[PDB]
Design a protein around this ligand. Structure first.
Ligand SMILES: *[C@@H]1O[C@H](CO)[C@@H](O[C@@H]2O[C@H](CO)[C@@H](O[C@@H]3O[C@H](CO[C@H]4O[C@H](CO)[C@@H](O)[C@H](O)[C@@H]4O[C@@H]4O[C@H](CO)[C@@H](O)[C@H](O)[C@H]4NC(C)=O)[C@@H](O)[C@H](O[C@H]4O[C@H](CO)[C@@H](O)[C@H](O)[C@@H]4O[C@@H]4O[C@H](CO)[C@@H](O)[C@H](O)[C@H]4NC(C)=O)[C@@H]3O)[C@H](O)[C@H]2NC(C)=O)[C@H](O)[C@H]1NC(C)=O
Ligand SMILES: *[C@@H]1O[C@H](CO)[C@@H](O[C@@H]2O[C@H](CO)[C@@H](O[C@@H]3O[C@H](CO[C@H]4O[C@H](CO)[C@@H](O)[C@H](O)[C@@H]4O[C@@H]4O[C@H](CO)[C@@H](O)[C@H](O)[C@H]4NC(C)=O)[C@@H](O)[C@H](O[C@H]4O[C@H](CO)[C@@H](O)[C@H](O)[C@@H]4O[C@@H]4O[C@H](CO)[C@@H](O)[C@H](O)[C@H]4NC(C)=O)[C@@H]3O)[C@H](O)[C@H]2NC(C)=O)[C@H](O)[C@H]1NC(C)=O
Ligand SMILES: Nc1nc2c(ncn2[C@@H]2O[C@H](COP(=O)(O)OP(=O)(O)O)[C@@H](O)[C@H]2O)c(=O)[nH]1
Ligand SMILES: Nc1nc2c(ncn2[C@@H]2O[C@H](COP(=O)(O)OP(=O)(O)O)[C@@H](O)[C@H]2O)c(=O)[nH]1
Ligand SMILES: [Mn+2]
Ligand SMILES: [Mn+2]
Lengths: 467, 467
C-alpha cells in the first residue's frame, strides 16, 4: 500500500466529512434568516462551498495519479489506441481490392459538417463490425466538391474502388453475407440495424477500457474519428501555422457557442455568462494544482459579434479566436472549403484544450469532445454541456441502472428500486436527471447520483491478422 | 490498476460532482423562500443531502478495501503491534532485576481511573524511551487496596522489585544516566520534559504507521494501554460472562454519557439526543453496506437514571447497559474494587463497539478509543466526540499545518497562509476549528478542511535484541 495513496484517500474522506459538518451548521443558520441577510449568507455559503468542493476534487485528481497510476493509465490507453488503429488500418488496406468485401458510404447527408462526419463514423463502425472495407464516396461534398481528400487522407491506401462481382443495398449482415459491395444508408433510415452501433463497445476491449476510461462508448467512437481526420500535408501545415498565429498555448479552456440556425430548432440560445461560470470554476480548479499565468479561452462560435462582447465582459481573460472564421460560418458561406477548413480548425483547437464548455446538442462540440478522448488517457469528464449529455445520433438506447432506491417527493419524480433499468434522456446539471423507469413505464425526474451507467458490449471482430 | 478501484474512484468523483450540482440548485431555491416554506424545504434538503453524503462515504469505505488493501492493512497493523508488544515485553523482563535500570511510577494520582491509567501510560512511554524497566507502585490505590494486581497482570514477570545501587528523582535523561532507579512524578509537574511524550510517535515506525493508520499518535499510546490492561483470570472470565449475559453482539455502537462531577468544571451536560443523532447517522451509514437487523447501543454512564430515559425515547433501539455498574459509579461509592471492575468492563465494551460516540473530555472515553485502535487496522475515525478532539493530557503542543490560505470573514476568524503552523485547540464539528496561528500570534476560527495534521516523530530506542 502506498503512503501518498493512503494519505490522499483519508484527506478526501475527511474533507467530505468536514463538508457535511459545514453544510449542516450553515443550513441550520440559513433557516433562521430573512431578506437580504439570507441572500448575503447564502451567497457567502456558496463561495465557501466551491473552494471546499474543489479541494476535494483536487485531492481526487491527485489520487488518480499516485503510485504510478498516471503512467500506467497513459501506457494502457496508448496500447489500446495503437491496437485499434492497427486493426482499422488493416481492414482498410487489403492486398486485393478487386476481391475485398466493401461497404459504401456517401458523405452527402443533408446536414452540417459534424453531422456528416458522424455519418461517416457510423458507416465506419459498421464496416469494422462486418469486416467490410469502408469505401467513402465524397464527390460533390457540399463543403468541398472535390471531396474528402481536399482536407483528409483517403480512408484507404490500397482500396478506394467500389467494384465487386455483386452489389446491393443494406439488407442485414446475414442476408448480405455473399454480397461483395453493400451500400449503407444514413442511420436515420437503416433497416435492419446491426449491433455495431454506439453506445456499445467491443467485447474484447470492454474490460481494459473500464480500467482506463470513464466513458468507453466515446473512446470507441473516438477511434474512428481519429482515423478519419488524418490530415493532408497542407492541412497539417495550416493547423501548425494557425497554432502559431493565434496564441494557442496551455492552459486553455475551449468554449463553443452555437447560435444562428441552431437556436429554436435543435437548441436554445445561451448567453455568454452561462458558459463562462463553468470556465471560471474550472480555472479555479486548475489553479489549485498548477500555476495559471493567464486565463485563456479558445472561443469558437458562429456569432461573429460575440468575441467583442466576451472580451468586454471578461477583461481578465485572453480570448483566442479567429473572428474571420466565425464570419465564414454564416449560411451565406457555410458550405464552402473556406468555411470547412475554418470549422476543422475550430474543432481542432477545442479538442486540444484542457477543458471544454459547450452545448452537446451541437455536433461540432461532440466531435471536439470525441477527438479530445484521443489526446488523454481518460478525458471522459473534461467537459461541461449546458444542455445534452454525450450522445451519438442513431445510438441504441442509453440505459442506466438504479443503484439506490428513490421515493418520489413530487409527481415530476419517478420511483426507482435498485436494478431498475432507467432510460436516461438528460442530466439537468442540478442533481436531477430525467428518464423513463422502463420497469414501471413512468417518465420523470430522479437523482443523478442514484444510478450507474450500463456499459454495453458487442462481439466485434478482433482482426488477429493485424498483429 | 484495478477495475473496482478505478470504478469506485470515478463514482466517488462523480458523486461529489452531483452533490455540488445539487447544492447549487437547492441553495438558489432556498434564497427565494420565506417562513415555513423555507424551513420545510431546508429540512428536506438536509435529508436528501445525508443519504447522498453517506453514498460518497460508503464508496470511500469500499475503495479502502479494494485490491487487497484491507488484507494488507490488517497484516501490517498486526506486524506493527506484534513488534511493539515484543519490544515492551522485552524491556519489562530483564534477566537480572538487581542490575536493571528502572523507572518507578506511583499509580495514586489525584484523579479517577482513566486519569490514573494514563499516568501509568505516560510513565511507561518515558520508561520505554529511557530503556528503563517500568516499576509500578500501586499499594493504597484508591480503587483497590490490593493494588494494580487486583485486576491486572503485573507489568513484569521478572522485575517488580525497585531496588538498585542508586536511586533518585527524575532530573533528565542525561543527568540520570548512572542513576539505576528513577522516580517519575506526574506529568503535571515533570521537569525537565523528555521527548518520549505524545502526540509524537517513534521515528522508526512512522512511515509504516502513516501507511496504515490515520492517527499514529493514538496507535502509539494504545500499545502501552494494550500491555497494561492484560486482565487477571477472574477479570478475564468476568468479561466473557458479561459479554454473554448482556447479549453484546455486533453491530453495536458504544455511547459514553459522562455527568455527575464532570459537569461544570471539565465538560458540559449533554442531553441523550446529542449522542443519538450521531448514533442514528452511523447506523444509517452501516445500513448502506450491511443488513442491520436491530440497532444496538452499548450505554456506559455514571447517570443511573439515563437508561430508562433512553429506552423510552428510542424504542426501536436495543440498549445494552449494566445499570448496577452505573449505580456503582456514583461519587459516594466510586473508589472501590467493584466500581473499578465496572468501569473496566464499561470501557471494554465501548472499545469493542463498531463506533464510539462520547465526549473526549472524559478520560473514560479516550481509554476506550485508545483500546479500540488495537482491535482494528485503522479505527482512528470510528468516533464522534461532542466536545474535544483526541488529546493525551500532558502532551506536547498539537500543531497542524495550513495547506490552503484563509482570509477571515469575521473578527472571530484567523488568517492563514499555506505552511503556517496552527496550534489547534478544538474542532467545533461545524466546519470550523479553533486555534492559534503561531506565525502571526492570532487566535480564532479557521475552516477545518484548510489544515493538515503535523505528525511528530522522536528517536526512540528500537530494542533490536527483542527479535
Ligand atoms: C437532419 O439534420 C440533423 C442535424 O441538424 C441530423 O442529426 C440529428 O439531429 C437531431 C437534432 O439535433 C438529433 O436529435 C437529438 O438526439 C438526442 C439523442 O437522442 C437519443 O439519445 C437520448 C439520450 O441522450 C434518448 O433520450 C433519445 O431517445 C435518443 O435515443 C434513441 O433511442 C432509441 C431506442 O430507445 C434508438 O433506437 C434511437 O436510435 C435513439 N435515437 C438517436 C437519435 O440516437 C436527443 O437527446 C435530443 O433530444 C433533445 O433535444 C430535442 C430538441 O432537438 C428536445 O426536444 C428533447 O426533449 C431533448 O431535450 C433535452 O432534454 C434533456 C432532458 O430534459 C435535457 O437535459 C437537455 O438539455 C435537452 N436538450 C435540448 C437541446 O433541449 C434530440 O432528439 C439526432 O440525434 C441527430 N441524429 C444524427 C444521426 O446525428 C439528422 O440525422 C438529419 N436527418 C437526415 C435525414 O439527414
Ligand atoms: C487533576 O485531575 C485531572 C482529571 O480531570 C487530571 O487530568 C487533567 O484533566 C483536565 C480536565 O479534564 C485536562 O484539561 C483539558 O486538557 C485538554 C488538552 O489540552 C491540551 O491539548 C489541547 C488540544 O487538544 C491544547 O489546545 C491545550 O492548550 C493543551 O495543550 C498543551 O500544550 C502545551 C504546549 O502548547 C503543553 O506543554 C501542555 O502539556 C499541553 N497541555 C496538556 C494538558 O496536555 C484541553 O483541550 C481542555 O480544554 C477544554 O476544556 C476545558 C474544561 O476542562 C475548557 O475550559 C477549555 O476552554 C477547552 O474547551 C474546549 O474548547 C474547544 C475549542 O473551543 C472545543 O472544541 C471543546 O469542545 C472544548 N471542550 C470542553 C470540554 O468544553 C482541558 O484543558 C488535562 O488535560 C488533564 N491532564 C492529564 C495529564 O490527564 C489532572 O492531571 C489532575 N491534576 C493533578 C495535579 O493530579
Ligand atoms: N467555424 C465554425 N463553424 C461553425 C461553428 N458552429 C457551427 N458552425 C458551422 O455550422 C455547422 C453546424 O452543423 P453541424 O456540424 O452538423 O453541428 P450542429 O448543427 O451544431 O449540430 C458546422 O458544421 C459549421 O459548418 C463554429 O464555432 N465555428
Ligand atoms: N463504570 C463507569 N464508571 C464511570 C463512568 N463515567 C465515569 N465513571 C467513574 O468516574 C471516573 C471518572 O474519572 P476519569 O477516569 O479520570 O474520567 P473523567 O473524569 O470522565 O475524565 C471513572 O474512572 C469511573 O470511576 C461510566 O460510564 N461507567
Ligand atoms: Mn464544473
Ligand atoms: Mn458522523
Amino acid at each position: 500500500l502506498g503512503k501518498d495513496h493512503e494519505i490522499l484517500r483519508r484527506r478526501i474522506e475527511n474533507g467530505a466529512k468536514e463538508l457535511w459538518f459545514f453544510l449542516q451548521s450553515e443550513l441550520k443558520k440559513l433557516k433562521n434568516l430573512e431578506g437580504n441577510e439570507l441572500q448575503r449568507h447564502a451567497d457567502e455559503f456558496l463561495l465557501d462551498l466551491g473552494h471546499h468542493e474543489r479541494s476535494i476534487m483536487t485531492d481526487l485528481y491527485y489520487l488518480s495519479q499516485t503510485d504510478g497510476a498516471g503512467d500506467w493509465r497513459e501506457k494502457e490507453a496508448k496500447d489500446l489506441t495503437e491496437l485499434v488503429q492497427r486493426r482499422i488500418t488493416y481492414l482498410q488496406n487489403p492486398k486485393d481490392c478487386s476481391k475485398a468485401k466493401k461497404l459504401v458510404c456517401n458523405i452527402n447527408k443533408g446536414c452540417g459538417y459534424g453531422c456528416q462526419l458522424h455519418h461517416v463514423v457510423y458507416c465506419f463502425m459498421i464496416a469494422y463490425g462486418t469486416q467490410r472495407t469502408l469505401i467513402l464516396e465524397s464527390q460533390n461534398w457540399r463543403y468541398a466538391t472535390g471531396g474528402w481528400e481536399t482536407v483528409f487522407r483517403p480512408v484507404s491506401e490500397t482500396c478506394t474502388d467500389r467494384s465487386g462481382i455483386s452489389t446491393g443495398h443494406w439488407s442485414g449482415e446475414v442476408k448480405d453475407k455473399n454480397v461483395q459491395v453493400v451500400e449503407l444508408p444514413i442511420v436515420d433510415s437503416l433497416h435492419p440495424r446491426p449491433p455495431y452501433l454506439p453506445l456499445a463497445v467491443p467485447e474484447d476491449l470492454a474490460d481494459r477500457l473500464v480500467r482506463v476510461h470513464g466513458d468507453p462508448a466515446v473512446w470507441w467512437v473516438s477511434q474512428f474519428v481519429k482515423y478519419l481526420i488524418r490530415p493532408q500535408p497542407w492541412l497539417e501545415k495550416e493547423i501548425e501555422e494557425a497554432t502559431k498565429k493565434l496564441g494557442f498555448k496551455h492552459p486553455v479552456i475551449g468554449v463553443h457557442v452555437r447560435r444562428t440556425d441552431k437556436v429554436g430548432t435543435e437548441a436554445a440560445f445561451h448567453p455568454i455568462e452561462e458558459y463562462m461560470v463553468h470556465v471560471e470554476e474550472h480555472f479555479q480548479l486548475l489553479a489549485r494544482r498548477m500555476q495559471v499565468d493567464k486565463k485563456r479561452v479558445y472561443l469558437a462560435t458562429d456569432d461573429p459579434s460575440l468575441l467583442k462582447e466576451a472580451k468586454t465582459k471578461y477583461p481578465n481573460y485572453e480570448f483566442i479566436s479567429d473572428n474571420s472564421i466565425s464570419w465564414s460560418a454564416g449560411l451565406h458561406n457555410r458550405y464552402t472549403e473556406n468555411s470547412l477548413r475554418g470549422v476543422i480548425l475550430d474543432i481542432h483547437f477545442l479538442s486540444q484544450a484542457d477543458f471544454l464548455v459547450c452545448t452537446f446538442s451541437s455536433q461540432v462540440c461532440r466531435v471536439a469532445y470525441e477527438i479530445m478522448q484521443t489526446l488523454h488517457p481518460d478525458a471522459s469528464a473534461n467537459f461541461h454541456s449546458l444542455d445534452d449529455i454525450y450522445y451519438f445520433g442513431g445510438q441504441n438506447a442509453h440505459n442506466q441502472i438504479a443503484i439506490y432506491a428513490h421515493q418520489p417527493r413530487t409527481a415530476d419524480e419517478i420511483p426507482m428500486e435498485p436494478g431498475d433499468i432507467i432510460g436516461v434522456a438528460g442530466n439537468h446539471w442540478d442533481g436531477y436527471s430525467k428518464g423513463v423507469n422502463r420497469k414501471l413505464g413512468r417518465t420523470g425526474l430522479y437523482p443523478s447520483y442514484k444510478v450507474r451507467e450500463k456499459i454495453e458490449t458487442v462481439k466485434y471482430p478482433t482482426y488477429p491478422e493485424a498483429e
